């Protein structure tokens, strides 16, 4: 069996959900979403923010708790074939993390630039912001934490210790979410011009750099793949 169709679902769920989110923000961007003090803004974007925050907290708790509770206690008695299957599942988790990272840190971040570059921002919770920081970021944080936990709890290579590159790849992009405080503080106070290259934005950049730890993470996963079932063929 080895690599199964969980990868198709991993791609499709993010693609479909974010396409629907884009449709929603295209429909309610203007017209209930321009005026932050209008009653329709509360029903179409503040309610969205509340619901998405509650659902993200619940989903993160449930997913992480399930992954930690179903952790493999007897990692020693794991056959190489099962280890290969678990390595493929972890690679599917990493693919989902990469897809979510794309959707969060490229699509909704830059689309955000457009939003701000076109309208006068009315609040810290613009309909679009709600989408980026309160969805395009918690979703990829949840996916990254889940992938890290799966590696630690199913892969003997990633067990017996916390991998530094994986921890950086998982936590650095997470630090972008608390960095939103610097974004707000340095939008309203510091810097009144809508410039995407203003220093109030270097907190997003610095912690975006930590995603480069995916390189060490991926060579670690390559070594984990090539533990018992490394071949032969490769180097033979």
């Amino acid at each position: 069996l080895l690599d199964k169709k969980w990868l198709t679902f991993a791609l499709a769920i993010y693609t479909v959900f974010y396409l629907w989110v884009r449709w929603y923000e295209g429909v309610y961007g203007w017209s209930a979403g321009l005026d932050s003090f209008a009653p329709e803004f509360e029903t179409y974007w503040m309610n969205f923010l509340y619901t998405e925050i509650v659902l993200e907290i619940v989903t993160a708790s449930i997913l992480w708790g399930y992954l930690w509770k179903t952790r493999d206690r007897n990692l020693a008695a794991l056959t190489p074939r099962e280890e290969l299957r678990r390595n493929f599942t972890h690679l599917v988790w990493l693919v989902a993390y990469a897809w979510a990272i794309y959707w969060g840190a490229s699509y909704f971040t830059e689309q955000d630039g457009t939003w701000h570059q076109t309208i006068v921002r009315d609040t810290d919770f613009t309909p679009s912001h709600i989408i980026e920081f309160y969805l395009s970021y918690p979703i990829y944080i949840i996916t990254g934490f889940a992938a890290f936990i799966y590696a630690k709890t199913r892969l003997p290579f990633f067990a017996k210790g916390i991998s530094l590159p994986y921890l950086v790849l998982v936590v650095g992009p997470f630090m972008i979410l608390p960095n939103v405080g610097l974004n707000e503080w340095g939008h309203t106070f510091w810097f009144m011009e809508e410039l995407f290259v203003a220093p109030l934005h270097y907190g997003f950049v610095i912690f975006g750099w930590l995603a480069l730890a995916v390189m060490g993470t991926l060579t670690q996963t390559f070594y984990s793949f090539a533990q018992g079932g490394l071949g032969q063929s490769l180097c033979e």
Partner: protein, 382 residues
């Protein structure tokens, strides 16, 4: 749509827009709508806002639903940032061409280099038609007419696709062979020196030479075509001509100003001294995009936005005609739902509880006088 969130005192004391007019309220695609009016730069410019040494006359709108055909300060076109003087009154004119159908809230705004957006009154303008009918023709000094909607789009797409294809070809050339794990094992276990061998080096040399040669040839071709080019035209424009307004014949001294918390009314006591030779009457109080009118004295006919217009929102304790030379003190109340809708009541949250505004005084013959008032605004709770 971006105001009602800015600080009430900052909206009150930055820039006062008046004599605003709109040529049309409903337009077709490609039809032009003109916005005219005057703005006065308040003398008590807040220290937190940089002085309007570098300011841009902008339009508040949800993206290019209109295109700014022209914009004027004084009588001269202002496509760049301009320098404004504190205390001066300028007249402006913005010409917009409809591009996208719908109902749009169009604001005239002034962006200041170190203070952010100063949004004036916004008016709903209806656009009907189809976006596909929109044209933005322009004639260059080289004698060709192009449509700015799609000019150079094909060339941009072609060049970007070409370079993306070159990069993808490089990556795929290296990706035909196995990529990650066997190459990693070969590099780790002993010297590799086997995964990069001729003609890989020849292919890379070809890629490098072709890239440099194609860049040079494309630049030369883009220089032979379009032989006449100019850099981007930028730079703040000085010498904006302000309006030479006559000195007002009305002097007003604000003796305290209060507003109820909570409430929708603002109360102030004014000592009005009438100079000149005509009986005056208080007709309007404009504070921040909100016009409180005394309907018995003046009526608005310029189609001011209804949510910003208080037809009878200005009540004067004694608004009888003020004979020349006579001085009297009256209690003026400006009350309207706009005071709470546009969050002018939220000056209680502000770190500077001072207001500014314009009082419009009208005589019998109809000629009007504009006087500016500013004073601390004291909340009242009991």
């Amino acid at each position: 749509h971006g105001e009602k969130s800015q600080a009430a005192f900052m909206r009150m004391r930055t820039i006062h827009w008046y004599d605003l007019s709109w040529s049309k309220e409903k337009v077709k695609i490609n039809e032009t709508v003109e916005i005219k009016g005057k703005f006065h730069v308040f003398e008590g410019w807040p220290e937190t806002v940089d002085e309007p040494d570098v300011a841009f006359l902008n339009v508040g709108m949800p993206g290019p639903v209109f295109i700014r055909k022209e914009s004027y300060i004084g009588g001269q076109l202002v496509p760049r940032s301009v320098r404004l003087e504190i205390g001066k009154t300028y007249d402006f004119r913005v010409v917009l061409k409809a591009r996208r159908p719908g109902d749009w809230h169009v604001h005239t705004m002034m962006n200041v280099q170190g203070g952010g957006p100063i949004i004036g009154p916004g008016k709903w303008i209806t656009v009907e038609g189809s976006m596909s009918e929109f044209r933005n023709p322009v004639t260059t000094l080289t004698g060709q007419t192009v449509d700015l909607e799609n000019y150079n789009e094909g060339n941009t797409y072609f060049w970007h696709a070409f370079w993306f294809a070159i990069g993808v070809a490089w990556i795929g050339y290296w990706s035909r062979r196995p990529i990650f794990i066997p190459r990693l094992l070969m590099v780790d276990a002993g010297r590799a020196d086997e995964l990069v061998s001729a003609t890989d080096r020849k292919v890379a040399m070809g890629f490098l030479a072709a890239t440099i040669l194609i860049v040079v040839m494309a630049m030369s071709s883009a220089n032979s075509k379009y032989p006449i080019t100019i850099p981007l035209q930028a730079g703040t424009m000085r010498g904006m001509k302000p309006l030479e307004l006559p000195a007002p014949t009305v002097s007003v001294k604000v003796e305290d100003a209060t507003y109820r918390v909570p409430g929708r009314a603002m109360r102030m006591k004014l000592t009005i001294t009438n100079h000149g030779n005509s009986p005056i009457r208080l007709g309007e109080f404009y504070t921040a995009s909100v016009r409180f009118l005394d309907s018995d004295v003046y009526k608005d006919t310029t189609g001011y936005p209804e949510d910003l217009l208080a037809e009878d929102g200005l009540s004067v304790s004694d608004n009888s005609p003020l004979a020349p030379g006579e001085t009297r003190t009256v209690d003026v109340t400006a009350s309207d739902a706009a005071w709470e809708v546009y969050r002018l009541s939220d000056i209680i949250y502000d770190p500077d509880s001072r207001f500014a505004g314009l009082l419009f005084f009208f005589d019998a013959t109809g000629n009007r006088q504009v006087v500016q008032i500013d004073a601390p605004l004291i909340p009242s709770f009991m």
